[PDB]
């Protein structure tokens with residue numbers, strides 16, 4: 001059981017060892033397409049690639065490659081697409097992927113600039129009157145509105161397939177206070193944000209998989225998805241004790257390498273799930289408490 005395990009690990013001060021064991025046991029599958037010469041400029045980081053078996057293929061005969069993986073959680077019955085922060089030449093591909101996969105939401109866990117360098121291209125419009133056109137994939141993107149909170153912003157975007165003139169509403173959830181290789185300010189802030197995403201319908205089965213990204217699409221993104229899946233699993237049978245967090249993380253790592261980048265992100269993942277469990281088990285008022293403690297206003 002996670003809370004007792006949490007205490008055992010904290011007491012023995014062995015998060016580093018627990019975390020390293022997960023890395024040792026993590027799946028290793030080929031990433032041949034990602035490593036092809038023609039795709040070198042479609043990858044942000046040399047050591048972070050999508051496995052071939054779970055990579056998202058763009059529906060174009062040209063080059064179907066994008067650094068994105070489909071994490072399909074069978075038991076939990078939820079899917080997520082984890083991808084890297086778009087590069088200046090892959091913003092059209094990113095939106096092509098959102099369209100073809102029928103995604104309703106995009107969860108961004110990083111800032112365009114972190115630690116003095118560019119971690120992601122400005123792939124969405126910052127002003128209503130300045131829409132963006134991705135000519136390579138023939139897609140149009142317009143900012144419809146935005147709701148800025150203290151540590152996250154929610155934007156409503158309109159994505160249009162210029163070929164058919166079909167349009168869709170895309171919700172953008174931008175967590176702005178999560179440091180690279182770091183952890184959220186508190187389980188509260190993180191949980192308040194995850195539940196904001198959930199309440200929007202973006203994670204629902206009627207839509208395609210939500211697109212989740214940070215800079216590499218494995219650390220913060222992994223932490224976000226692990227927490228969500230674990231909470232959904234204990235929701236399925238109202239049995240928090242049946243959920244094995246390490247087991248769930250290992251299952252997710254069969255779909256994309258390096259999910260959860262530090263021992264403290266793993267430790268934070270446990271904290272988020274244990275605190276989130278109060279809501280799952282019937283204490284509805286805890287959601288208001290998180291909102292309060294997160295200081296979003």
Ligand SMILES: O=C1C=C(c2cccc(O)c2)S(=O)(=O)N1
Nearest residue numbers: 180181214215216217218219220
């Ligand atoms: O906490 C993190 C660390 C990342 C990271 C960034 C660059 C290389 C890498 O291996 C991990 S992320 O953008 O996937 N989230």
Ligand SMILES: [Mg+2]
Nearest residue numbers: 126127128129
């Ligand atoms: Mg204005």
